[PDB]
Ligand binder design. Sequence first.
Ligand SMILES: [Mn+2]
Length: 385
Amino acid sequence: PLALLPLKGLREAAALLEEALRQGKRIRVHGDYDADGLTGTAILVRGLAALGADVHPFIPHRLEEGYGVLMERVPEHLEASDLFLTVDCGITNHAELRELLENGVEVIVTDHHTPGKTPPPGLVVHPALTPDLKEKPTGAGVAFLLLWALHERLGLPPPLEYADLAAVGTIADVAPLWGWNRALVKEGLARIPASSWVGLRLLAEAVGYTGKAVEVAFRIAPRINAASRLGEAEKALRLLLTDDAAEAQALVGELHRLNARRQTLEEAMLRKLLPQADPEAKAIVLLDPEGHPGVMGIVASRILEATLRPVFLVAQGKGTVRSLAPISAVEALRSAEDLLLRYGGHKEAAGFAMDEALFPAFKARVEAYAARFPDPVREVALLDL
Ligand SMILES: [Mn+2]
């Protein structure tokens, strides 16, 4: 049964929010552009506003600026808020220490992604930093809990009215769905048909939602994620806020387009690139001069799943990477570094930019790099698929 799951930080957070409410502070909710993040952002933005707060959302542009809090827009975050609230990001954006410094903007970091060495500055609400807890809530999950807590003090009923959104974000992030997640999802799914948010009702209707969870995961979530991938996140967020049946359906249709267009672009890129793969290579290094970068990542993962080799795709001047077993995406990019303009990431995934003119040289460098190291087949349980 749904219960306000512990979580080390909620009390302090709720405190800070109520404080903001009374003082009429400007609250900027900085979420992610994926379904979990957008959905979570919606919860806090409506919830707070519902309690007469001064809230406005802020979503990054997946294609121009990356994920998380962007340092370049920090100055802009300052002039716009008194309380900076993070939704599905933050824990590794330590340079928002400038938030607390530069001016006195209180920072509340909500997240669920793998934490770094040290937590980031500010009041943190992360499930992995809660002592003896193994519930695994998602970004939208944490926001829901956060809205719940704020409801506790102030003395208002639990925010069940918001479980649907929270449910969409959870399934979207394919959480275990075995812990408290189950109660949230089950409760959420049930409230979708005729929920309190037209955008979500109409959408659920459009995709013929019956009540199944697979329907949220395979028809609803894709539609919401499709927007950011084509530089149209806002459209998705607005759908989730709006509550104007008119504007709603218009948006539902705009998401239909976006989703279809994303799918067509993946299929198109895939059938152009897959044949060029070839598992005989220590690393797959392909170049689709005219490929939409907002879709390469997906294609890279599928090419990997198919070849069990590191994949390096470059389209326009951008590049993504997906590798496994020995080879590390970033470290591969370490060499050839000179050939790049920028680059960053981790072991399994990484990104970068470069002048396509150096592609041949880059391909040979990365190939040679993976030439060292064993063959990934001597590691994966193949359930890797
Ligand atoms: Mn998430």
